[PDB]
Amino acid sequence: SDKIIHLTDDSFDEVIRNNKLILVDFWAEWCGPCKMIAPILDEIADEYQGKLTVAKLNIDQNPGTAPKYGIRGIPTLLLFKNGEVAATKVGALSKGQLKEFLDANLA
User: Fold this and answer.
1) Which interval of the chain is the signal sequence?
2) Breaks (C-N over 2.5 A) in the chain follow
3) What is the phi-psi region of residue 101: left when phi exceeds 0, alpha when psi lies from -120 to 50, beta otherwise?
4) How many CB atoms lie within 10 A of CB 91?
5) Catalytic site residue from 7, 23, 34, 45
6) How distant is the alpha carbon of residue 75 from its chain centre?
7) Catalytic site residue 31?
8) How far is CA 73 from each of CA 26, 67, 84, 94, rounded to the nearest angstrom?
9) Distance of alpha carbon 73 from its chain centroid, rounded?
10) Cα 99 to the chain's mean position, in Å?
11) What structural domains and CATH numbers belong to the chain?
């Protein structure tokens, strides 16, 4: 939970550039599915500590980033490798499904 960076429009670009592998959760307090999958991510940031950074962008509070990265709706997860977008998972999902998506995109 406190392993999860909260990005702002302002902070975004620097952060993703700044650490190798990072997973961003585009979310909002009104989006139920985003609320739903949030504790999954909590666990992921623990379970993947040291291999993968996990971050949230609240879009109500950071209106500009989503269009910038072609986020058409939430939830939507972005995996960046080396400061660049690598894979993208749209819609709600189970830990299992998320874990696969992660594994199948690291090494």
Assistant:
1) none
2) none
3) alpha
4) 11
5) 34
6) 9
7) yes
8) 8, 10, 20, 18
9) 13
10) 13
11) 1-107 (3.40.30.10)
